[PDB]
Amino acid sequence: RVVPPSLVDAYINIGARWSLDPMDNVNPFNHHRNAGLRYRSMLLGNGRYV
Amino acid sequence: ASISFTSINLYATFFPMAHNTASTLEAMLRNDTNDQSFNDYLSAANMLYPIPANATNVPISIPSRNWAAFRGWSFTRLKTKETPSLGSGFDPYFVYSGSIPYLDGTFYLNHTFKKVSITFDSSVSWPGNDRLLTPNEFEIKRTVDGEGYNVAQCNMTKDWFLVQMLAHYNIGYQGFYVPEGYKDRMYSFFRNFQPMSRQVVDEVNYKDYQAVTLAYQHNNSGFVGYLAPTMRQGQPYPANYPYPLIGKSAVTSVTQKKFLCDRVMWRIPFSSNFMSMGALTDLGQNMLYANSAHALDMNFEVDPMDESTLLYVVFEVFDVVRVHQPHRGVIEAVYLRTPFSAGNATT
Amino acid sequence: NFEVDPMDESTLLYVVFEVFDVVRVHQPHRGVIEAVYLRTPFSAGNATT
Amino acid sequence: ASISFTSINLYATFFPMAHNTASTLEAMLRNDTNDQSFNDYLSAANMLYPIPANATNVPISIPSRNWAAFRGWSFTRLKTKETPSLGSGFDPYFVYSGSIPYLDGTFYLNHTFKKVSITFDSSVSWPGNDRLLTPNEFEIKRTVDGEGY
Amino acid sequence: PFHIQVPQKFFAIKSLLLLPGSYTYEWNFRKDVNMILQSSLGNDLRTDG
Amino acid sequence: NVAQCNMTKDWFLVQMLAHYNIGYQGFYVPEGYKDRMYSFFRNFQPMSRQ
Amino acid sequence: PFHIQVPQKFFAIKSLLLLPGSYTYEWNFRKDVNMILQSSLGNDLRTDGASISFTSINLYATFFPMAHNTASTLEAMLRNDTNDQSFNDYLSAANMLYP
Amino acid sequence: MSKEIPTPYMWSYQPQMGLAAGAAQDYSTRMNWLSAGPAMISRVNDIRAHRNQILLE
Amino acid sequence: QDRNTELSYQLLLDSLGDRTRYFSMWNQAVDSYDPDVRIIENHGVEDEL
Amino acid sequence: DINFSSLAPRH
Amino acid sequence: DINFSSLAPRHGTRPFMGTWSDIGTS
Amino acid sequence: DINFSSLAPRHGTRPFMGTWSDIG
Amino acid sequence: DINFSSLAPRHGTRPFMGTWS
Amino acid sequence: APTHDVTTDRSQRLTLRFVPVDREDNTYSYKVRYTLAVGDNRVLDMASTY
Amino acid sequence: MATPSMLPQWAYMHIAGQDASEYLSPGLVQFARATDTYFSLGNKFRNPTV
Amino acid sequence: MATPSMLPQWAYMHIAGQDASEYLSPGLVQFARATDTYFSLGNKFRNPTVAPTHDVTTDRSQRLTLRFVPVDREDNTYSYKVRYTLAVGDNRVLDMASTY
Amino acid sequence: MATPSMLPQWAYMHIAGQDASEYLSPGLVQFARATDTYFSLGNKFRNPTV
Amino acid sequence: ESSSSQPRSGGIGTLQFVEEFTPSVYFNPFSGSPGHYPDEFIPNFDAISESVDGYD
């Protein structure tokens, strides 16, 4: 499933601090720059067999 | 993904206390006046009430109860798909593996709440001594605000802001100066509260407005893929997507204001003045100056959501245990939960 | 449960739930007016979805 | 059509009376046993429930609630387009301009009701102490007399 | 359009405790846009709109 | 061993009682006062790969 | 097309007298054909092509009609602590199955 | 005759015709459940004795 | 069932030291999000050359 | 959040 | 005994003047 | 030293049975 | 009613009297 | 027999059925939730439910 | 949760206590003789045997 | 007596009553203090913490904030003046740190 | 407050209890019935009908 | 001079509900004849008709 990059480009609410409306109801801890969950993942290493 | 366990050991780390000062200690703690006492950090009676898809209100009813030693409500909103059933080992319908806000405290839907009503006996408002600008009910935020009851650059009510500041730090009557970092933790209200606003073009004042949908929007043409992360396509041409707000053909626009709190549970103390005054509140001891059992009915109002959601209300109580050992290899306890039932209870 | 007739157009059902809605209005001093608003089985904090 | 206001002005009329008569009255009605009290002519909780187009039933469920000091119910049918919302002062979907039967008692769809069933705890038919000749429900109307009902 | 809360900064009544009675409080405000706004280039905002 | 490194749990106990005096009431993160630049905890980084 | 009446067998709700009030009640029902259908040869009915679907499930109940004076006297004496109901499991068991 | 020393009856509240809306047993209290030791029979029902005595007075 | 202790242990450890100091033994390493992802502070790009 | 005061005797 | 069944705080009674069931508590 | 000073040689005297030290 | 003429009460406001100070 | 002093006289159904308030259908199970309500001054036995 | 354990919790759960008609109020006993000829209230209360 | 009736239960279970250092035997109290530097026993016990029930706050017939409309307005060209006639009720006190 | 959680103020709002000639001061009642031909004030006071 | 209203009879106040309705301990539950049983612990009972009617 691929998103249009024109939906969130780099012109979105330019000049303001706003969280997108379809991102307010999205879980933000289900993100890959969650650095707590990055830590736990790589504390077990990069294999799928641990 | 599959996981299995081979070998689980238990490790005990013993202080090598001296023999004859350890026997002094033992003798002391076989007394029933020296019996150890503990309490749960968040003393809670935990209730989950479904919110149907796009429901705007969820009433709560509770039968008559002696509310001796009760402490404030706290509440947050979860998602049905993200919360597993509790009380039953294995939930087969739980097909989610992301963060579980129920158990991790990773709340993020606290900004959809819009009112809370507290009623005892179904006829008397708890905010009924006219403690609030809107006399019955706390309002969490204002939609349709023309009477200026909002704190700085967000929808949050002045009344709500006051309650929260009092709840988590006891400040409101000496101003609203920032808390110290000692008393402003990772899950404290103040830290996680972020106002925000933008201005965006309307149609009820702007007369050259065209609603162009995403497909027919173009901006940065000839340099980006068309509605896909593919290779560039098209020609350099004037853009036509966003509308200026700079100074040259800056269009009329309408402010959108909102806030976000994440990792915060909303909290209303059960206290006559919402500032904290030690663990046992003055209204927990006023159910001993008001011996009786009252019904507790509440009402909440939330934003619609397409996804099914849950309402998680922590009724704060005292979960407290007293652990005695009378004799060697004997341990026992008496457990007490105060306004919610002390035992038998829920399985 | 109310059994209505079919209508071609969208319609609303208007149900009135009759209550007492009484206001005590009294002034105990110059330039001081206060009021208590009570509504009996449906109060000002109790409502249906 | 467009309306302007220039001058929104407030008027008051006072009963002239002696300033001993006036001041006696003030002291009498500054006691809280002489508190004035007022109530609505139609004192009611007012709730609107949709009827989908071509629906034949509307279910209502109300939560467990104390019904001390409860009087009757009344009911009538309105239409979606002929009813504005008063809860939002903004209301751009209202395209009607005729007689609004919500804010004026100009009801006209009270012949489009066939039955109403009232029950408590989903197991007690309220006027079902055999009071009605058809006990478990009221019927507003029926086709076929069925022995002169 | 803006909504803002502005504190009292005067060092005699910003931490004062004020007892019962009726008082007349007035404070005046400044509508000059070179004193209530800040700029990032320090350009005059009264040679601009 | 101590989770996700070669370090032994016997050793870990000794170094936690020598740099912070903790281990008989359980292992916990030191205070900022307790462990500094040249103290154990801040400099101890486990790791693994597959 | 079947129509069946199916009892509860759990021992804490077997013969309880449930007094006035509203109670949620929820129970799960299997749809595995092997589990709920016996055979005389003990085939694999999943393999064979047996299939089942539940359409409509309701919960019947029957109240004794009782004088309201005498059934509120009874209520009074069953809402009391020392008038607790108590049941046994007919076979009280700890089930341990060993290979 | 005597069946325990029982939990008190908590009266409810109502908008007053002059009734107290009945009463019901207190179930926001222990002292009649299980799990502790048999040496707490006069340490937990002495509590329940004390609560009742304060009530009569 | 109406006790919750998994949640309550995360609140315990926010009241005792920092949650941002990671400990690999008992696996403390609090979940976080970057506040530049959730809240988007688009302030353009510094193309000027 | 913040629950309960100092639950340790002052030594 | 071997499998539980011990229950019953009941006897049953019928007042005289015939057998007339229910005494309705004494 | 550009600075303030306040009533501070007296302290919260409260017991672990009441968050308020009484007043006659 | 079939009346087109008010009554007078035939008595002034307040029966009840206070002392001179 | 008793003189109607053991039986209702204010009209109540003997036989009732509670329709589901929720139904969940699945690939191997079915879950049916009901509200089982007992009116005031009525005695319900769970032996007679099915 | 409360005191009953060992011999005490065999008198609370009716494993080894007194009669089944001595746990109960004397009035509930008398109403379970009067009406237990058409509506058995008994057989819902444990009787111990030792 | 005339005391709260939940007081014996609370006292026992340390929701109210006396600090565990008046509740504990005196020998245990001095043991804990002696070995406080390497073997804490403080977190094994509870201290009751209890609000004042009287003379503190009465919320009866009082809002916790008021709004005051202007009673003067000057809408000059560079300045604006507004007056407010404050009313501080009897048996109330105002802190000016929370005026904004 | 936790003590007010009922309304004996269902007679404070006059929908039960006393009629207006019994809950009013006797001086107001005299004033009211001596001025009613030219200034009515009988509509300002609820009378309960029960 | 001026005075204040006539005595009122009705339900008890909420401040005086607490003092009139201290919790009751029944020490010999449901012992003796019916007619000495508390029927005023039933929230459906009326003692000025001695019947329990809830219209359910």
Numbering used by the authors:
A (entry chain C): 497 to 546
B (entry chain C): 596 to 942
C (entry chain E): 894 to 942
D (entry chain E): 596 to 744
E (entry chain A): 547 to 595
F (entry chain B): 745 to 794
G (entry chain G): 547 to 645
H (entry chain S): 1 to 57
Give sentences copied directly from the paper behind this entry.
The ChAdOx1 viral vector, adapted from chimpanzee adenovirus Y25 (ChAd-Y25), is the basis for the ChAdOx1 nCoV-19 vaccine (AZD1222/Vaxzevria). We have determined the structure of the ChAdOx1 viral vector and used it in state-of-the-art computational simulations to demonstrate an electrostatic interaction mechanism with PF4, which was confirmed experimentally by surface plasmon resonance. Here, we characterized the capsid structure of ChAdOx1 and the primary receptor binding fiber knob protein. We have characterized its primary cell attachment protein, the fiber knob, and show that ChAdOx1, a simian adenovirus, shares considerable structural homology with human adenoviruses.
We have resolved the capsid structure of the ChAdOx1 viral vaccine vector to a resolution of 3.07 Å, the highest reported resolution of an adenovirus capsid to date. Determined at 3.07-Å resolution, ChAdOx1 has the quintessential icosahedral adenovirus capsid structure. The asymmetric unit contains the expected penton monomer; one peripentonal, two secondary, and one tertiary hexon trimers; one peripentonal and one secondary copy of Protein VIII; and partial density for the pIIIa protein. The pentameric penton protein, located at the 12 fivefold icosahedral vertices, had weaker signal, which could indicate a less well-ordered, or less stably interacting, protein than those observed in previous cryo-EM structures of HAdV-D26 and HAdV-C5. As in other reported structures, the penton RGD loop (residues 305 to 335), which is responsible for binding to integrins following attachment to the cell surface via the fiber knob protein, was left unmodeled because of the lack of signal, indicative of its flexibility. We observed partial densities for 12 copies of pVI in the base of the hexons that adopted two conformations, either wrapping around the hexon interior before extending into the capsid core or extending directly out of the base of the hexon to wrap over the top of pVIII. Hexon was well resolved, including the hypervariable regions (HVRs) on the exterior, enabling a complete reconstruction. ChAdOx1 is more electronegative than HAdV-D26 with negative charge extending into the interhexon spaces, while in HAdV-D26, it has electropositive charge in these regions. Results show freely diffusing PF4 frequently contacts the capsid surface of ChAdOx1 between the hexons, most commonly at the interfaces of three hexons where negative charge is concentrated, and the interhexon space is maximized. To identify amino acids that are potentially important for the ChAdOx1/PF4 interaction, we calculated the frequency of contacts between PF4 and the ChAdOx1 hexons in BD simulations. These indicate PF4 contacts residues in the HVRs of ChAdOx1.
